Amino acid sequence: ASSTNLKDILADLIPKEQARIKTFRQQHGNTAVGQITVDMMYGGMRGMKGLVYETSVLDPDEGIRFRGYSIPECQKMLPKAKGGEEPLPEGLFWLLVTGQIPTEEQVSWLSKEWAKRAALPSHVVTMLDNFPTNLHPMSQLSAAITALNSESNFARAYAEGIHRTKYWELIYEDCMDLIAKLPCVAAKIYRNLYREGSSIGAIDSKLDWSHNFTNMLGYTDAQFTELMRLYLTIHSDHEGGNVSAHTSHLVGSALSDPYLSFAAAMNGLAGPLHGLANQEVLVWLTQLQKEVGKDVSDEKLRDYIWNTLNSGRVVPGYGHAVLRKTDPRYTCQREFALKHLPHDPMFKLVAQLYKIVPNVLLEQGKAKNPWPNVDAHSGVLLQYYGMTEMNYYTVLFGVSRALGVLAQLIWSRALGFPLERPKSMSTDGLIKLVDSK
Amino acid sequence: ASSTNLKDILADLIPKEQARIKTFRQQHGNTAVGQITVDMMYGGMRGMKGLVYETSVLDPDEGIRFRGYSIPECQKMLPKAKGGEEPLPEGLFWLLVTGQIPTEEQVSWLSKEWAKRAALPSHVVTMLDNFPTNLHPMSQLSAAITALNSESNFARAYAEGIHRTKYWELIYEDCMDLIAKLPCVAAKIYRNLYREGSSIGAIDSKLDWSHNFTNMLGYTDAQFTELMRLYLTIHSDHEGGNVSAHTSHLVGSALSDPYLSFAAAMNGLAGPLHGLANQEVLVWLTQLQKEVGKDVSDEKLRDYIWNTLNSGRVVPGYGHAVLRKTDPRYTCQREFALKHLPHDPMFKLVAQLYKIVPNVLLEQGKAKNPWPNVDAHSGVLLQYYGMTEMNYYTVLFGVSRALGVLAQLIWSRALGFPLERPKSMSTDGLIKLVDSK
Ligand SMILES: CC(C)(COP(=O)(O)OP(=O)(O)OC[C@H]1O[C@@H](n2cnc3c(N)ncnc32)[C@H](O)[C@@H]1OP(=O)(O)O)[C@H](O)C(=O)NCCC(=O)NCCS
Ligand SMILES: CC(C)(COP(=O)(O)OP(=O)(O)OC[C@H]1O[C@@H](n2cnc3c(N)ncnc32)[C@H](O)[C@@H]1OP(=O)(O)O)[C@H](O)C(=O)NCCC(=O)NCCS
């Protein structure tokens, strides 16, 4: 019988997995998977195998895998966009949730379903309209998404005491609704702040999520949308260990609904040391250009970089807590630029920084990863198509990141993952424990 | 020379600690402090020694310690309130930050300084006023605090590239400002939602934080305020392992400012499995009373409890992820009730549940901790003094929790704790790792 629907494919998957993990655990749960040292406890779990997080895994040399699907693999296999060359973010979502590579037909369903669900409640539209213009786009986003929780189906089934065993099904509704709304929140922000007077207009059921987004942003450039598909897809997910994913995961585990847990993830992504580096790169470049001037040398270029390190500041967009090579999401962005915007001054600068920064970082002998990460390359692309308002960039990272984070949330919950609740120590107790005892 | 100021006492403390940890780590950082099993990874870090968290530590038998200061110890040593019998929350804060038991004189400074800082920006006052009346108080709180980030001194010193080494000093300003504002946010919510038409009025520099709070709530009862001091103090902090503290800690570590990280902590506290149990207890009791009727027997009382367990629901306010006995914060609440409200029907019910629940939980053979936690006893006290709007209760938990969470944030940052970034695995990789490899 019938046609397409991810929640049924989920319904079929979940029990098989539920069984799979229980055998595995019934046999291998005792197994020491690794040890904890005291440096690990002071180093922010650096090295720690903390979680189980299904929808992707980060390799220190290779970089991310979406099943065992590398970014090059995703680039060629996922459905493009019916006259395009970038993966549709939709079918990354389907991959993530389902482990399977979508069919064209699956993805139109995703597109159209996200379009169906895409509406904003009057109060969120109110709040958005009154927000101050010195309130950071990330702050605006987060607030909105916390406010939207009003409309959580989960939070309402939970208050009405459902059976634990149907949590996922409700957490799936909210996730699918969150994802649909998100570009309406985001594009309302961009529109209030930077396009005063104008409206985000109507979502068209015949477009893909990316295109309706760029339309609501007000971008007509064909290639911008393509840039958009590629952007939203590579920023999707980055294992569970990273602050934003781990936040949602943590807060999720207390059975806070999908809006609440996502907006917590947002006040993580707005960390300078996290997704706010997007922005931070461009502010840094921009200053470099002013302060260090137009067409600098590899010798002056280094003077600028040392003036930062010598100031007890960080060089944005460089380094990573797990990758030990160049981010493939960096390479992927570089390719695009080589392809579409090669003569762009800012690009040429970012390409010359790649020549210099990792050697300066290697010289300083501090950084364990002197190589660039996604954030190093992202803003230069946006800049090019007239997206010059760099304080908003993290919100795009934010819209994309929902895809990975809410894909896992549905599994977390369909697998019945507990309250994440580690143990803590004070240095005092630590000092007495390992040595004193 | 001169008079009182915590930031100088901090300034003196920090280097000593900074040195202390570096020796300790230079010598004992290698030390295996514990191991990770695969059950631990699927059990939400249950058992895992994750973090270093200074301001308190949770013992599984004894329960919390604020230095090595147990709740009974705090009850007798901390400055009361110049004609009271409950610890002033202020001097719990001083203890937490400084490790020292405050002097009366320290605490008046705290009181008066918190009063100084206590103002809300027009936009937050706007947003608050427009919020819908079906938007949960916790959602309202969180949103507001994310919105307040506008006013972060940290976030502005960071954009202006300070030296890493002065982070704490800015993170101290914001924390002290957050804590001051908080009861103005909270009391504005209570006032809009439940007291329509009326205003929170003016903070008086001669009152303590607790009293200005109860005044803004509109409570005149002397004993209510005392209840307030005791409440705000025992909910302060609960090591770093718990969702709310761990959220702020996580998001904090990305150098998200103290408002952002706190409101993330809030969408954690609004987890049913976390601080929302406050509320959940009272909804459960209230139903019990309706559904199971006024003065029930120990036999019918058990029928109600089984109808919940048999429904794949949880019994609220019972259990804990680390304590293996009755929460001392439970006992402490029970004492108060014995003292002030012994004939209260709801109390008598909560006292009879203590008789029955842990035996029903012990029978079901599921719960590792069949004993009550703070949330089991809290709402019954509020109820009594006319605070009957149980959807707000978690916000009180929320105001109190800022004290522990922001005390640690200043240390985290003055000690230069890194980005919290554990490693994740999918079951797939896990299955291949321990056994397959
Ligand atoms: C992602 C990041 C947080 C990795 O954290 P990490 O794993 O703890 O970093 P490492 O393991 O490499 O070791 C950290 C040391 O190297 C230095 N380091 C790491 N990245 C650096 C960078 N890009 N520039 C300068 N120094 C850096 C730090 O000074 C630190 O020294 P410390 O112990 O004296 O504090 C990141 O490398 C960083 O701190 N900065 C870049 C983040 C970014 O893009 N920021 C933009 C906003 S300014
Ligand atoms: C704090 C809490 C999350 C502890 O988590 P934990 O350490 O993972 O729980 P445990 O180690 O005791 O083991 C959990 C098992 O015991 C049961 N359990 C724990 N607390 C229970 C409670 N109060 N009522 C019923 N069952 C409970 C769970 O069914 C679970 O079974 P499962 O593996 O089939 O899912 C808590 O005990 C809980 O789940 N519920 C109470 C939280 C609360 O106050 N909620 C109010 C809103 S309804």
Q: Do A254 and B243 touch (CB under 8 A)?
A: yes
* B397 C-beta closer than 6 A to ligand 2: no
Find chain B residues with C-beta within 8 A of A276's C-beta.
254
* A367 C-beta closer than 6 A to ligand 1: yes
**Alpha-carbon span B224 to A197, nearest angstrom:** 50
Q: For residue A359, give every residue at least 6 positions away whose Cβ sits within 8 Å of its Cβ, in sequence order, or none.
A: A370
Atom of ligand 1 nearest to the CA of A376: 44
**Alpha-carbon span A229 to B348, nearest angstrom:** 61
Binding residue numbers of A: 329, 401, 421
**Alpha-carbon span B142 to B155, nearest angstrom:** 18
Which residue matches tokens 């992707």? Answer: A56
CA distances from B221 to A152, B87, B228 (A): 37, 18, 11
Q: Do A36 and B49 touch (CB under 8 A)?
A: yes
Find chain B residues with C-beta within 8 A of A373's C-beta.
none
**Alpha-carbon span B239 to B43, nearest angstrom:** 19
3-class SS shares of chain A: helix, strand, coil, % to 5: 60, 5, 35
Which residue is closest in CA terms to ligand 2's atom 6?
Answer: B321
Q: Do B256 and A264 touch (CB under 8 A)?
A: no
Q: Which two tokens stand for residue A24?
A: 């595995």
DSSP-assigned letter for residue B79 = -
CA angle at B153 for the pair B149 and B158, rounded to the nearest 5°: 100
**Alpha-carbon span A58 to A65, nearest angstrom:** 6
* B273 C-beta closer than 6 A to ligand 2: yes
Pick the catalytic residue: A211, A246, A375, A377? A375
Minimal Cα distance from B257: which residue of A?
A271
CA distances from B335 to A227, B209, B253 (A): 63, 23, 38
Among the bound ligands, name the one nearest to the CA of residue A158: 2
- Name the 3-class secondary structure at B198: coil
Q: For residues B137 and B394, is the Cβ–Cβ distance under 8 A?
A: yes
**Alpha-carbon span B5 to B11, nearest angstrom:** 10
What are φ and ψ of residue A189, in 5° steps?
Answer: -65, -50
Closest CA to A141 of A187, A185, A193: A185
Pick the catalytic residue: A211, A246, A249, A320? A320
Task: Go through A91-117 and write b for each residue having 16 or more CB atoms within 10 A of its CB, e for each that does not.
Answer: bbbbbbbbbebbeeebbbbbbbbbbee
Binding residue numbers of A for oxaloacetate: 329, 401, 421
Find chain A residues with C-beta within 8 A of B163's C-beta.
311-313
Q: For chains A and B, count residue pairs whose Cβ atoms are closer than 8 Å.
A: 402
Testing ligand 2's pocket by substitution, the residue of B40, B273, B279, B282 carrying the most ligand atoms inside 8 A of its CB is B273
DSSP-assigned letter for residue A52 = E
CA of A84 to the centre of ligand 2 (A): 50
- Name the 3-class secondary structure at A423: strand
Q: Which two tokens stand for residue A22?
A: 């229980």
CB hemisphere CA count around B179 (13 angstroms): 29
Q: Which two tokens stand for residue A406?
A: 């809410």
Q: Which two tokens stand for residue B370?
A: 């069949």
Looking at residue B101, its amino acid is: I
Q: For residues A149 and A257, is the Cβ–Cβ distance under 8 A?
A: yes
Nearest Cα of chain B lies from the Cα of A335 at a distance, in angstroms, of 29
Q: Is A274 a catalytic residue?
A: yes
* A179 C-beta closer than 6 A to ligand 1: no
Alpha-carbon dihedral of residues B236, B253, A247, B261, nearest 10 degrees? 50
Which residue matches tokens 């599921």? Answer: B366
In sequence order, which ranges of B78-136 are alpha helices (DSSP H)?
Answer: 89-98, 104-117, 122-130
**Alpha-carbon span A392 to A278, nearest angstrom:** 9
CB-CB neighbours of B343 under 10 Å: 6
Q: For residue B162, give every residue at least 6 positions away whose Cβ sits within 8 Å of its Cβ, in sequence order, or none.
A: A312, B170
> Helix B167-194 crosses helix B122-130 at what angle (to 10 degrees)?
30
Length, in residues, of chain A: 437
Cβ burial, residue B3 (10 Å; 0-12/13-18/19+): exposed
Beta strands B423-425; A49-52: pairing state = parallel
- Name the 3-class secondary structure at B425: strand
Q: For residue B332, give every residue at least 6 positions away whose Cβ sits within 8 Å of its Cβ, in sequence order, or none.
A: B71, B75, B230, B234
- Name the 3-class secondary structure at B406: helix
* A208 C-beta closer than 6 A to ligand 1: no
- Name the 3-class secondary structure at B118: coil
Q: Do A425 and B270 touch (CB under 8 A)?
A: no
CA of A159 to the centre of ligand 1 (A): 43
**Alpha-carbon span A401 to B420, nearest angstrom:** 18
Closest CA to B252 of B322, B179, B168: B168
* B54 C-beta closer than 6 A to ligand 2: no
Where residue A202 falls (left for φ over 0; alpha for ψ -120 to 50; beta otherwise) is beta
* A419 C-beta closer than 6 A to ligand 2: yes
Closest CA to A393 of A380, A403, A407: A380
Q: Is A320 a catalytic residue?
A: yes
Q: What is the DSSP string of A299-314?
A: THHHHHHHHHHTTT--
Q: Do B435 and A28 touch (CB under 8 A)?
A: yes
- Name the 3-class secondary structure at A79: coil
Q: Which two tokens stand for residue A76?
A: 């060629």
What are φ and ψ of residue B116, in 5° steps?
Answer: -50, -35
Q: For residues B123 and A143, is the Cβ–Cβ distance under 8 A?
A: no
CA angle at B128 for the pair B122 and B130, rounded to the nearest 5°: 105
Beta strands A57-59; A49-52: pairing state = unpaired
DSSP-assigned letter for residue A57 = E
Q: For residue B76, give every residue at least 6 positions away whose Cβ sits within 8 Å of its Cβ, in sequence order, or none.
A: none
Q: Which two tokens stand for residue B351?
A: 């006292």
Which residue matches tokens 């058990």? Answer: B302
Q: For residues A103 and A79, is the Cβ–Cβ distance under 8 A?
A: yes
Asked: is B277-391 a CATH 1.10.230.10 domain? The reply is yes
Q: For residues B337 and B378, is the Cβ–Cβ distance under 8 A?
A: no
**Alpha-carbon span B30 to A156, nearest angstrom:** 48
DSSP-assigned letter for residue B150 = G
How far, in whole angstroms, is CA B169 from its chain's centroid? 23
Q: Do A143 and B139 touch (CB under 8 A)?
A: no
Which residue matches tokens 């260990």? Answer: A241
Q: Do B421 and A158 touch (CB under 8 A)?
A: no
Among the bound ligands, name the one nearest to the CA of residue A280: 1
What are φ and ψ of residue B52, in 5° steps?
Answer: -105, 125
CATH number assigned to the domain covering B1-276+392-423: 1.10.580.10
Domain boundaries, chain A: 1-276+392-423, 277-391
DSSP-assigned letter for residue A171 = H
Minimal Cα distance from A150: which residue of B?
B135
Q: Do A434 and B31 touch (CB under 8 A)?
A: yes
DSSP-assigned letter for residue B299 = T
Task: Go through B113-131 and write b for each residue having 16 or more CB atoms within 10 A of its CB, e for each that does not.
Answer: bbbeebebeebbebbbeeb
Find the distance separating the first CA and the last CA of chain A, reported in whole Å: 67
Q: Do A263 and B142 touch (CB under 8 A)?
A: yes
Which residue is closest in CA terms to ligand 2's atom 20?
Answer: B319
Where residue B249 falls (left for φ over 0; alpha for ψ -120 to 50; beta otherwise) is alpha
What are φ and ψ of residue A68, in 5° steps?
Answer: -130, 30
**Alpha-carbon span A95 to A130, nearest angstrom:** 38
Closest CA to A213 of A239, A197, A233: A233
Closest CA to A430 of B61, B421, B50, B40: B50
* A280 C-beta closer than 6 A to ligand 1: yes
Alpha-carbon dihedral of residues A212, A213, A216, A221, nearest 10 degrees? -90
Find chain A residues with C-beta within 8 A of B129's C-beta.
none
**Alpha-carbon span B213 to B225, nearest angstrom:** 8
Q: Measured over all CA atoms, what is the biggest interatomic distance in chain B, rounded to whole angstroms? A: 69
Q: Which two tokens stand for residue A3?
A: 């046609």
**Alpha-carbon span A229 to A409, nearest angstrom:** 23
Q: For residues B274 and B243, is the Cβ–Cβ distance under 8 A?
A: yes
List residues of B with catalytic annotation.
Answer: 274, 320, 375
CA of B367 to the centre of ligand 2 (A): 6
Atom of ligand 2 nearest to the CA of B277: 46
Nearest to B425 among A38, A49, A162 (CB): A49
- Experimentally, the structure was elucidated by X-ray
* B243 C-beta closer than 6 A to ligand 2: no
Nearest Cα of chain B lies from the Cα of A83 at a distance, in angstroms, of 35
How far, in whole angstroms, is CA A306 from its chain's centroid? 30
Q: What is the DSSP string of B8-57?
A: HHHHHHHHHHHHHHHHHHHHHTT-EEEEEEHHHHHTTSTT-EEEE-TT-E
**Alpha-carbon span B378 to B397, nearest angstrom:** 9
Q: Residue B25, annotated ligand binder?
A: no
CA of B322 to the centre of ligand 2 (A): 12
